[PDB]
């Protein structure tokens, strides 16, 4: 079971299990969750800001967090 | 440049132009839900099914890796 299917690119999970396959193909891991985080944060944000013209508080509101955090992210990113 | 499709990046920019011309106040945790499920199923995949090794692959604890293959269902 998978909790949506309105992210397609055909959904997006099927680009992250490619991605990583592809990966795993080439040797010791230990970062591998915060190595996919950024790589999908990054562009999330990129993308939330765009739609709402860089309105911060409606960036956290439409994503569920609240504006700290988003600044955190954003900071983490340099996007600040 | 290590995780590639090209960049995976690029696909979750289009995924979400896609998802945007649909149109919410849960997408941080709907894209985390559409990452995370498939990192956790390769990875499990990849240790056949050994935690120890999953969770020190990822760079979390056990616990922690426990709590998200609950929290998707995947017990």
Redesign the interface.
Not at 1 to 4: A, D, K
Not at 6 to 9: E, H
Not at 61 to 65: T, V
């Given at each position: 079971?998978?909790?949506?299917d309105?992210?397609?690119?055909k959904?997006?999970?099927?680009?992250?299990?490619?991605?990583?396959?592809?990966?795993?193909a080439q040797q010791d891991?230990?970062?591998?969750?915060?190595?996919?985080?950024a790589?999908?944060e990054?562009?999330?944000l990129?993308?939330?800001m765009q739609?709402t013209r860089a309105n911060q508080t409606r960036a956290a509101?439409?994503?569920?967090?609240n504006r700290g955090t988003l600044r955190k992210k954003l900071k983490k990113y340099g996007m600040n």
């Open positions: 079971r998978v909790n949506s309105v992210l397609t690119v959904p997006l999970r099927d680009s992250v299990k490619q991605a990583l396959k592809n990966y795993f891991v230990n970062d591998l969750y915060e190595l996919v985080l790589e999908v990054q562009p999330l990129d993308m939330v739609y509101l439409m994503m569920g967090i």
